[PDB]
């Protein structure tokens, strides 16, 4: 029996648009926890992000939709799916349409905290590639995450 809810920390993030994941960008997301509430058809996301170099915390709520996607508002509109789930990781695929109407596909590897399993990393790189995102568009978040636990 797989437990998807709980503590999840971001390891890596891939993006079709580099402007969304660099320094202090909306999508350089340092995840802390994800709680799935199938009973109420919602998902709870807690994470840190940086603006002006300082850590800011967000606690969002997404709504479960068709298939096994989730809609959530943040720096525009987002539709994400947990593409992969193991005992040690989660790989999220997200499609963001920002305020300007520009569409960006992104991927993220989440783990239980800092020590990455290569088996999970290879699946993330594979998912990222399948989404048309180049290897050079992958950022190592572990090295950038200096926000509070
Ligand atoms: C809406 C949304 C989508 C994706 C992520 C990470 C997987 C990068 C979020 O933190 C939030």
UniProtKB/Swiss-Prot annotation:
GO MF term (any one): odorant binding
Domain of life: Eukaryota
Protein keywords: Disulfide bond, Olfaction, Pyrrolidone carboxylic acid, Secreted, Sensory transduction, Transport
Cysteine-cysteine disulfides: 55-147
A single BP term in Gene Ontology: sensory perception of smell
UniProt-listed CDD domains: lipocalin_OBP-like
Any Pfam family the entry gives: Lipocalin
Principal location listed in the UniProt entry: secreted
InterPro entries, per the entry: Calycin, Lipocalin, Lipocln_cytosolic_FA-bd_dom, OBP-like
Subcellular location per the Swiss-Prot or TrEMBL entry: Secreted
GO CC, one annotated term: extracellular space
Family per similarity comment: Belongs to the calycin superfamily. Lipocalin family.
Subunit structure: Monomer.
UniProt function note: This protein is found in nasal epithelium and it binds a wide variety of chemical odorants.
Protein name per UniProt: Odorant-binding protein
Annotated organism of origin: Sus scrofa (Pig)
